[PDB]
Amino acid sequence: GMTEYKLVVVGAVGVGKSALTIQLIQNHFVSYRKQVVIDGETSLLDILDEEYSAMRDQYMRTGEGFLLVFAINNTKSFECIHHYREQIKRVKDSEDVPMVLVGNKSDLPSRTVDTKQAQDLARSYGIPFIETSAKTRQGVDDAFYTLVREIRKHKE
Ligand SMILES: Nc1nc2c(ncn2[C@@H]2O[C@H](COP(=O)(O)OP(=O)(O)O)[C@@H](O)[C@H]2O)c(=O)[nH]1
Numbered sequence: 152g153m154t155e156y157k158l159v160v161v162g163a164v165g166v167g168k169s170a171l172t173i174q175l176i177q178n179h180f181v182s183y184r185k186q187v188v189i190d191g192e193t194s195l196l197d198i199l200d201e202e203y204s205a206m207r208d209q210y211m212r213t214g215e216g217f218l219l220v221f222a223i224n225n226t227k228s229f230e231c232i233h234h235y236r237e238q239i240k241r242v243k244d245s246e247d248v249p250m251v252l253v254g255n256k257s258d259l260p261s262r263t264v265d266t267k268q269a270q271d272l273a274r275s276y277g278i279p280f281i282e283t284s285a286k287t288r289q290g291v292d293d294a295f296y297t298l299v300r301e302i303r304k305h306k307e
């Protein structure tokens with residue numbers, strides 16, 4: 152009776168992909184599944200489980216929506232976003248794939264990527280940007296819920 156969405160969290164190593172997922176589900180900071188209610192509608196999210204790692208194309212292809220995560224104190228991680236977005240476009244064979252740009256570790260003061268640079272990038276890609284902290288939970292439900300909204304809009 153309930154929609155199920157396969158979400159992929161992608162980004163450079165140590166940007167907080169795992170921590171974001173654990174925060175979402177367990178509300179704690181040290182596939183995975185969670186049911187959420189968004190706009191009145193219950194959905195089951197299935198979040199599929201070194202500088203950076205390249206992910207299997209077949210794995211990427213199973214995602215219905217993607218969080219593109221970088222860490223706001225890691226400029227190299229922000230550089231990687233382009234490559235992950237290009238991989239998603241390639242494997243999904245579409246310029247229009249549900250995605251959100253996520254700038255993580257917003258609780259840290261050592262910032263090297265300005266909110267405005269990321270805002271401008273996300274505008275160029277035509278996607279929402281959300282600053283998050285896996286540590287404080289700031290932004291976390293917003294990132295995932297916004298992604299589900301993107302998926303639902305795309306399906307309509
Ligand atoms: N301060 C802070 N540290 C974070 C945040 N998210 C992740 N970390 C830390 O960053 C490191 C890498 O996080 P991890 O989830 O393993 O990154 P992944 O490789 O992208 O899955 C760990 O030491 C985490 O505790 C966050 O929002 N704030």
Ligand SMILES: *CCC(=O)N1CCN(C(=O)CNc2ccc(Br)cc2C)CC1
Nearest residue numbers: 203204205206207208230231234235238
């Ligand atoms: C900073 C992030 C970055 O430079 N990249 C580029 C490499 N990459 C890929 O995902 C592309 N490589 C890839 C993927 C699947 C298969 Br099958 C084979 C290959 C070579 C990670 C992001």
